[PDB]
Amino acid sequence: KVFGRCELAAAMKRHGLDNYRGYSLGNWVCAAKFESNFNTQATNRNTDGSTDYGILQINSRWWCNDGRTPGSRNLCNIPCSALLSSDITASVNCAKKIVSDGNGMNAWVAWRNRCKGTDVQAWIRGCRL
Numbered sequence: 001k002v003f004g005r006c007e008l009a010a011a012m013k014r015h016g017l018d019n020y021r022g023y024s025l026g027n028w029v030c031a032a033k034f035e036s037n038f039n040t041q042a043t044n045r046n047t048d049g050s051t052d053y054g055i056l057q058i059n060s061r062w063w064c065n066d067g068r069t070p071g072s073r074n075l076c077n078i079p080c081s082a083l084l085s086s087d088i089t090a091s092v093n094c095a096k097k098i099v100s101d102g103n104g105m106n107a108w109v110a111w112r113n114r115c116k117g118t119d120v121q122a123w124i125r126g127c128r129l
């Protein structure tokens with residue numbers, strides 16, 4: 001599924017992400033735009049052999065099992081394919097564990113390089129929330 005901007009804001013809010021660990025909703029929408037262009041089916045392979053999955057591009061070396069990243073952890077206890085569903089619940093629940101682990105949203109390179117320190121409320125402007 002390719003989400004709209006306000007459609008995704010509303011789903012993320014419903015799932016408890018607005019102000020989760022102090023990050024306003026616009027931070028989460030901005031990160032999903034530059035990580036996946038709002039496409040739940042996005043995958044990208046990294047040099048170390050791991051793969052990033054779904055709307056927030058969650059990595060198989062630490063967070064999910066894809067059966068081809070040797071020595072990897074499955075800290076969200078899910079198959080990586082569950083992160084590609086049109087239902088974002090699994091992605092959201094796993095992202096809450098990542099952002100809680102000490103480094104906040106700096107875990108998402110595109111958030112660090114393209115959202116951090118910008119007017120991120122612009123990403124939810126105009127939406128009926």
Ligand SMILES: [Cl-]
Nearest residue numbers: 024025026121
């Ligand atoms: Cl915001």
Ligand SMILES: [Cl-]
Nearest residue numbers: 021103104105
């Ligand atoms: Cl933080």
Ligand code: NA
Nearest residue numbers: 060064072073
């Ligand atoms: Na893994």
